Design a protein around this ligand. Structure first.
Ligand code: PLP
Ligand code: PLP
Lengths: 424, 422
């Protein structure tokens, strides 16, 4: 009685194909120009931080330790913003470095410097190895993969599961000394929405790796970025490494790009004492230090960690209805057919949609014909290669709800037409 | 009579007297510092408004870009256009970054080492040896970058008209030589300025390395002490005219214009070099801080607004330089122990003392509570082969502290000289 599309008989699927073609032609007739690709805050979210454009303000230029933020010096970032983030994340302030307005920049730099110089645990620079391998949980973040691609690292994929990366697979892979590191987005992961559990974190902390200088990039970009009233747990991953006897394993990051201003916020690097010393030793050759004025501006804007969480409540209220609309259209158009699976995230910036394998690129092509921009098939995979051609990323944050409704209704029609083509 | 011409008896008397004066200095329990090439608080106060810019509701660049959101690797048009106008170059030449030009210099060297630059046949990491030309006295933070990368640094004199071009043109015949540092206007620390003729030689010279780069770090491009602004040679244009369009990586910043560490940096280079840079920069991140760029554009308004700011800096700094020069004149000139630059701009005075004594002068000054930068600080690997050069940084302290500090330094110079000759 219930029958999925893949189980429709030959005639039934042919007739379905004719029907959904009608619907697609109706869609194309609307002459839409809509875009579901932009993983960035809306204007209304950026409005929240309007005061920050006037901070720290005339005459307000002393950090909490007396530092004149207007003059040179200090590689670590100012104590005011470091302490707020330490309090927010529940870690010792000593673990926290605060940078400029890009956490990606710091991730690039620590990889780059490991490549040139070696890290503090290296016996030689990564540039001297015949092959460098890097573990990539998928679906994941294109800008991560682009860094390791640029450096010529062989990227080895593993599944990103509901509780984190597949640890049976990771534990096996790291037995090869070619493997130097891995990427993970541990909370509301980009784009699955999945979150690393304590058990998986402990496995990452305790596993033994063949490379003596192996590093996990723990890019906690969505550390407080809830859609609900409940904030996710902040695992003190640096502390878990230390407890396991692998203190230098984790390079942890976060930022305020999706809290304040996207591209004009403050970044953070959290790591062990030996790793911090290594980083600041190199960073002090690269320059005199980060922008302390913007750090003070941010400290004044937030006040304290509760002030950060109050801002995140504002973002949640803005984003929630957008996620809800996408989810409700996916359900109302697709659920009955058994053609697609999608995440129901509790935070972060994306919904991850799996369609009939072999059809994701066709869905994106159909959507384009109908004036709806989707992120390309494979975009969440190393080298833009999804071996199942099934996954699509949806970005609800920017457009208004009315645009999301029309666009997602269109996407649903494209999913069904591509599926009908595939099965017929 | 110069000190070096005093006879044994006379130098002995001099030595005893100056040693007593040094002891009297050391008893004052001073805590002074002539090392910091930083703007003073009074200079930083000029930009107080900038701490509140661009202000609520003011977030659009001139082309309509929302500066609060992601994207754009080149910097915003407003600040790029002001600097293009200020420097007299096409706006297309100008990239605007974050608050450190050193960071960009480091990056382009690092990326040449890892990846090669756009004219490389292989990354610099693949070379057995990389050599780099270092005009001296020069900037320690430049030399620290090339030291960190393990490049062999080859010194050449920084003369009044720029680097010794006979020496440079010979050195670049060696394909191991991949580049060169220069501070081309009010050079750090000599105050010397590259002439048109030397710039044309740099632009036209044949280099053995196909991917040779000059770092033209024009940190003091508008940083006059007199209110006469120096010529801005369009060095990128000169390289283009000479048929070496990709030779120059040019830099400047607002660190000594607005806020030191919270300003805006600039990278000026050829089209092919810009494409190479932004290709790599776009992997490193999503782009620079456009809000601070807009803040700076609003603060200045236009190139004339930048020059008005530089006049404020000149009026603050000129009396400090004058006071230092007056004390050098009144304590040292008659003895023939020292020579010093008399700069028209920039942040330093370069002082040469009796050869073999610079480290002793710095040690004596430290005993007396006066911090001087160490001997060799303006040389690669901190190695001044004559042990004669010292840097003086007048900008931060008030002139009252400068007079006490410099009087003490002069006593140290004379004691070290007396020890040397006795
Ligand atoms: C996983 C992840 N990391 C990093 C970033 C970008 O961060 P930043 O602006 O600090 O470079 C993003 C985008 O928000 C992201 O999704
Ligand atoms: C020659 C030179 N270049 C660069 C700098 C530092 O510039 P930034 O703050 O833009 O890194 C200085 C200090 O003013 C300098 O003397």
């Amino acid at each position: 009685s219930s029958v999925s599309l893949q189980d429709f008989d030959a005639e039934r699927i042919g007739l379905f194909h004719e029907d959904i073609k009608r619907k697609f032609d109706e869609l194309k007739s609307k002459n839409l120009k809509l875009d579901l690709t932009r993983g960035k805050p809306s204007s209304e979210q950026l409005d929240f931080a309007d005061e920050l454009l006037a901070l720290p303000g005339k005459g307000d230029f002393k950090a909490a330790d007396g530092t004149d933020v207007r003059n040179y010096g200090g590689l670590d970032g100012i104590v005011d913003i470091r302490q707020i983030w330490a309090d927010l994340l529940g870690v010792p302030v000593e673990q926290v470095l605060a940078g400029d307005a890009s956490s990606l920049n710091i991730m690039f730099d620590v990889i780059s410097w490991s490549y040139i110089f070696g890290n503090n645990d290296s016996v030689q620079p990564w540039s001297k190895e015949e092959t460098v391998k890097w573990i990539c949980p998928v679906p994941g973040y294109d800008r991560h993969f682009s860094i390791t691609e640029r450096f010529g690292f062989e990227m080895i994929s593993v599944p990103m599961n509901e509780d984190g990366p597949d640890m049976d697979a990771v534990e096996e892979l790291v037995k090869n000394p070619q493997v130097k590191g891995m990427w993970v987005v541990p909370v509301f992961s980009n784009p699955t929405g999945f979150t690393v559990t304590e058990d998986v974190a402990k496995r990452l902390s305790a596993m033994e790796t063949a490379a003596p200088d192996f590093r996990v990039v723990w890019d906690n970009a969505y550390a407080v970025h809830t859609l609900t009233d409940e904030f996710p747990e902040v695992i003190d991953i640096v502390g878990l490494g230390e407890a396991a006897g692998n203190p230098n394993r984790f390079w942890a990051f976060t930022s305020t790009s999706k809290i304040t201003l996207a591209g004009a916020g403050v970044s953070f690097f959290l790591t062990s004492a030996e790793n911090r010393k290594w980083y600041t030793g190199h960073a002090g050759i690269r320059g005199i230090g980060p922008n302390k004025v913007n750090q003070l501006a941010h400290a004044r804007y937030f006040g304290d960690a509760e002030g950060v969480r109050a801002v995140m409540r504002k973002h949640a209220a803005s984003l929630a209805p957008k996620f809800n609309k996408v989810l409700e259209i996916l359900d109302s158009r697709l659920a009955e057919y058994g053609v697609a699976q999608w995440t129901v995230p509790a935070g972060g910036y994306f919904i991850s949609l799996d369609v009939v394998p072999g059809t994701a690129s066709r869905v994106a092509e159909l959507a384009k014909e109908a004036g709806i921009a989707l992120t390309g098939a494979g975009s969440s995979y190393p080298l833009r290669q999804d071996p199942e051609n099934k996954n699509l990323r949806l970005a609800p944050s920017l457009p208004p709800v009315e645009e999301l409704e029309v666009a997602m209704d269109g996407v649903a029609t494209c999913v069904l037409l591509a599926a009908a083509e595939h099965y017929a």
